[PDB]
């Protein structure tokens, strides 16, 4: 399977920079969203899942098809409560019709990070809608429920290394896990709507208790009304995970840059970029612009 990317007809960064400011003042107006979390964990949650169906081995799912707007993928189990960010972002296709599906998905997770003071992303346009037809079947997004050599092997079908994948789950510091959708309830911090190293912070430090939610599972909890889910706490039980996270809570600056670095490599897997394709967009904060 080749996926080549294809920029929007004559479309730029200056079109795009228009989308990115549209999802951004929308995050700053519609604040009240979930106990005033917000919309932008959410929609860094659409982004991995729409990119978390690839498979290395025959290059099908991936962010390249925007297939999530069929029936199959919009009603696969895993994705529960993702329908708010497709919600969230309808209104805005519908005043940029020519940008891809694929494409609105994944900057609509960039601009997410960054609003929330995250590390800047570089993005890349070009994806390109695909027959309901293409659209992965259910059964490819990693359960909550398993161990280190779960998510480690898991991972190795988007071929993201040990690293990528500590440096990726930093982003469970966003938002909450929410009973009706997953059967795990709770936040992980204090700051879940700040991008911040404190996922790793709160792995080490807190006193984690074993117990049973109301959905009959098992997940850790705290006596600061913090959670981590089973695959989370994972990390601190893996001696090679165990010391990236160490590094992590050590050096915001390191763990920003890996971030970024394994974010766009997710939202990119599968997609062949042609080498007079534009460079990678970086754009800027409506704080940067004054906006
Ligand atoms: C083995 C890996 C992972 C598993 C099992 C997993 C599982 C979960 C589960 C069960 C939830 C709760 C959903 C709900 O009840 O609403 C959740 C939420 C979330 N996850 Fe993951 N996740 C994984 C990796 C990741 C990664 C790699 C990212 C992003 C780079 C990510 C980002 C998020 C975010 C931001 C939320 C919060 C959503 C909200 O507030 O509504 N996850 N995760
Ligand atoms: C979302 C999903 C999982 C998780 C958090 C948020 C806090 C720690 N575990």
Redesign the pocket.
Known sequence: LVHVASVEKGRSYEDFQKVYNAIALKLREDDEYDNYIGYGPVLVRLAWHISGTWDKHDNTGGSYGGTYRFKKEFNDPSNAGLQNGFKFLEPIHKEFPWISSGDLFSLGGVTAVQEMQGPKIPWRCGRVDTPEDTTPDNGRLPDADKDAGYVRTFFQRLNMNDREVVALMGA??????HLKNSG?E????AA?NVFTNE?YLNLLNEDWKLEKNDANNEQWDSKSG????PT?YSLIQDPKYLSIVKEYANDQDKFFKDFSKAFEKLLEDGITFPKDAPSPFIFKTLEEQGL
């Open positions: 469970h510091a966003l938002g909450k896990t795990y709770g936040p992980g911090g879940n996922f913090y959670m981590m889910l989370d």
